[PDB]
Amino acid sequence: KVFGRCELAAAMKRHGLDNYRGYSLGNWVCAAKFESNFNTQATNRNTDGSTDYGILQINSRWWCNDGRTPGSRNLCNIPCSALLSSDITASVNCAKKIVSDGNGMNAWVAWRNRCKGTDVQAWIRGCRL
Give the footprint of Na ion on this chain (CB under 5 A).
60, 65, 69, 72, 74
Q: Are 67 and 49 in contact (CB under 8 A)?
A: no
Give the footprint of Cl ion on this chain (CB under 5 A).
67, 69, 104
| Partner from Na ion, Cl ion, none contacting 91, C-beta within 5 to 8 A by type | none
Whether 35 is a known active-site residue: answer yes
Which of 25, 93, 23, 15 minimizes the C-alpha distance to 58?
93
**Which is closer to Cl ion, CB of 67 or CB of 117?**
67
**Which is closer to Na ion, CB of 40 or CB of 72?**
72
Residues 6+ apart with CB under 8 A from 103: none
- Determine which one of 18, 35, 48, 119 is catalytic: 35
Q: Are 122 and 26 in contact (CB under 8 A)?
A: yes
**Which is closer to Cl ion, CB of 38 or CB of 65?**
65
Distance between terminal CA atoms of the chain? 21
| Partner from Cl ion, Na ion, none contacting 104, C-beta within 5 to 8 A by type | Cl ion
Whether 52 is a known active-site residue: answer yes
Q: Are 36 and 2 in contact (CB under 8 A)?
A: no
Point out the residues that are catalytic.
35, 52
